[PDB]
């Protein structure tokens, strides 16, 4: 909760809308979300990668988690480390460079 220094400047997506999932990845371990823009992922969860951050944080990725809904969840997106997931299936090529804005990386 609050404004923190951006992990990166630009990311990669399947389209300029970043509404499509680049690759479907499986979770290998547990992860706890500290800040608002982070996502909590348990070992074995299904997580879809929507954007991959590069530059200042080429090791940090982002997307949504499929499995737990009970209301919303998969609609506000989040971020997670690449080291906790393994990509084996690509649903669409992530060759669209989209930069971030003021409203990104900011929770109220």
Swiss-Prot record:
Any one of the GO CC terms: extracellular space
Tissues in which the UniProt entry reports expression: All malignant melanoma cell lines tested and infrequently in glioma cell lines.
Location in the cell: Secreted
Subcellular location, principal: secreted
Disulfide bond sites: 13-18, 36-107
UniProt GO BP: extracellular matrix organization
Role this protein plays: Elicits growth inhibition on melanoma cells in vitro as well as some other neuroectodermal tumors, including gliomas.
Subunit structure: Interacts with FASLG. Interacts with TMIGD2.
Family affiliation: Belongs to the MIA/OTOR family.
Protein name from the UniProt record: Melanoma-derived growth regulatory protein
Span covered, complete protein: 25 to 131 of 131
């Amino acid at each position: 909760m609050g404004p923190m220094p951006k992990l990166a400047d630009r990311k990669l997506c399947a389209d300029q809308e970043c509404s499509h999932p680049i690759s479907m990845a499986v979770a290998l371990q547990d992860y706890m979300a500290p800040d608002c823009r982070f996502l909590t992922i348990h070992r074995g969860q299904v997580v879809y990668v929507f954007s991959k951050l590069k530059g200042r944080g080429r090791l940090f990725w982002g997307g949504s988690v499929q499995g737990d809904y009970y209301g919303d969840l998969a609609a506000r997106l989040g971020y997670f480390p690449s080291s906790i997931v393994r990509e084996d299936q690509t649903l669409k090529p992530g060759k669209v460079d989209v930069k971030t804005d003021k409203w990104d990386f900011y929770c109220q």
